[PDB]
Amino acid sequence: TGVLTESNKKFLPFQQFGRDIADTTDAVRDPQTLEILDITPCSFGGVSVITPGTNTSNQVAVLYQGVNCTEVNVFQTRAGCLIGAEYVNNSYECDIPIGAGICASYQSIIAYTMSLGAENSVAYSNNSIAIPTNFTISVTTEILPVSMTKTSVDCTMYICGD
């Protein structure tokens, strides 16, 4: 199953079919008329559903991965076509990752380019220094997994039972 586009490839007279580097057909010669056609498979995409928690809302957005918007609140991203989210020029922290610098959040569902950080310009000069005059004692949490559940499998009973 494929689209048959015009081909610029010059086949030798014996050759009938054409193959990719990976041994998949990319070209063919028509039997009725001796012309070369570029066989290209029909478009496919990975449908991804972007949703907030169900209790908060039931609105969803659909991302078609790798599919241009013209071949399927519609916005075009490098990741694919995003339908059901409205692009906002504002930048916020990432809530739901879409990819290619695009993130989604619920406020309706909006898509935006995520802000890396707040912008700070340090006042560097040849002869000025900044000295702390006070301190904060900060306690922070680090959570590390140490062990897993210990599992034993009876191979004979699992495969065969009694």
Partner: protein
């Protein structure tokens, strides 16, 4: 907050559930129940059906063991990191940056958690910074004076020497400065008096 430990627990349960789920798979055989296969067929074809079930179940079990081994390696690496943190953050003060909390590390406290450890990192964070005019050295009597442990700061009219991480201005003296060379070599040296005790 405790997502990582729960995730590990979730994976183990999920893996077992998947393995249990695999028992309900025909694997290309007439039935997924061995007892039905024995009850319904003669041994020459029952052997073939049992073989199909055995190969599918064995493949499932091998897949489960392979994922378990990869997860075991990941957990072992995490445990080794946790042991390193326990030795270096709890049993000692660490000069490594960001190893034992954000900021300058002071001490750490271990807390047990299911399948895990939680480290409470007590760190010192500088705050309320103030601008000062600074110089590399002080020129007094044709000699260059450098801070032994601090930095030279000026509030606009007077020069003092203070510790780098806290503002504590002190009079510039021979006690807290050392003399190396003449003033001319140093770039940016400023002229100020150096007190003698």
């Amino acid at each position: 907050a405790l997502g990582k430990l729960q995730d590990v627990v979730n994976h183990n349960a999920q893996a077992l559930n998947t393995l249990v789920k695999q028992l309900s798979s025909k694997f290309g055989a007439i039935s997924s129940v061995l007892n039905d296969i024995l009850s319904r067929l003669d041994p020459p074809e029952a052997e073939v059906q049992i073989d199909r079930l055995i190969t599918g179940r064995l493949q499932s079990l091998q897949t489960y063991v392979t994922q378990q081994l990869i997860r075991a390696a990941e957990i072992r690496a995490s445990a080794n990191l946790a042991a390193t943190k326990m030795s270096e953050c709890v049993l000692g003060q660490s000069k490594r940056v960001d190893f034992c909390g954000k900021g300058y590390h002071l001490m750490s406290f271990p807390q047990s958690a299911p399948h895990g450890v939680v480290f409470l990192h007590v760190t010192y964070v500088p705050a309320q910074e103030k601008n000062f005019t600074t110089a590399p050295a002080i020129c007094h009597d044709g000699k260059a004076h450098f801070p032994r442990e601090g930095v030279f700061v000026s509030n606009g009219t007077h020069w003092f020497v203070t510790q780098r991480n806290f503002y504590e201005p002190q009079i510039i003296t021979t006690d807290n400065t050392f003399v190396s060379g003449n003033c001319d070599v140093v770039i940016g040296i400023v002229n100020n008096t150096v007190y003698d005790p």
